[PDB]
């Protein structure tokens, strides 16, 4: 009957940008595999809730 077009709200991408900003801050107090694992947890926490919205 209809079509549903989807985009990501600006507060969500702002929250993810500030998220990776604090992992850049925490890079100086932890190692490299820890901040890459933290990047990965943030990327699953974005993408598995933003599956069709990331495209």
């Amino acid at each position: 009957t209809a079509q549903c077009f989807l985009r990501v709200d600006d507060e969500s991408m702002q929250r993810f940008h500030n998220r990776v900003r604090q992992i850049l801050m925490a890079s100086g107090s932890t190692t490299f595999t820890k901040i890459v694992n933290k990047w990965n947890t943030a990327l699953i926490g974005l993408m598995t809730y933003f599956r069709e919205a990331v495209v």
């Binding site: 947890t41 699953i44 974005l46 598995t48 809730y49």
Partner: protein, 112 residues
Amino acid sequence: LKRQEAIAQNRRLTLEDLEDSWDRGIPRINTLFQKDRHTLAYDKGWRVRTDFKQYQVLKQNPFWWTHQRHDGKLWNLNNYRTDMIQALGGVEGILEHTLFKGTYFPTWEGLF
């Protein structure tokens, strides 16, 4: 349909929950068949307490909308690693890293 078929007949669900591959459905059917069904069925009122746990212990959770023992693992990324291997070759690090002065390692599959 298969539950009412097994009630109408007198058989047992031996391996007929395998056509749906044991990990399908948005509640992920293997959540029902686990160790803690009778206790985690009494954990009602969830997915909202985890969102209020941003007003608790300082580790910010990116998983406020789910936890695996009630709605299940909603994604199984397992073959992305294997396709990363097949995209960079199975010798993706052995030519680069000195495995040769690690020991005499001829196999590189028992490495831990």
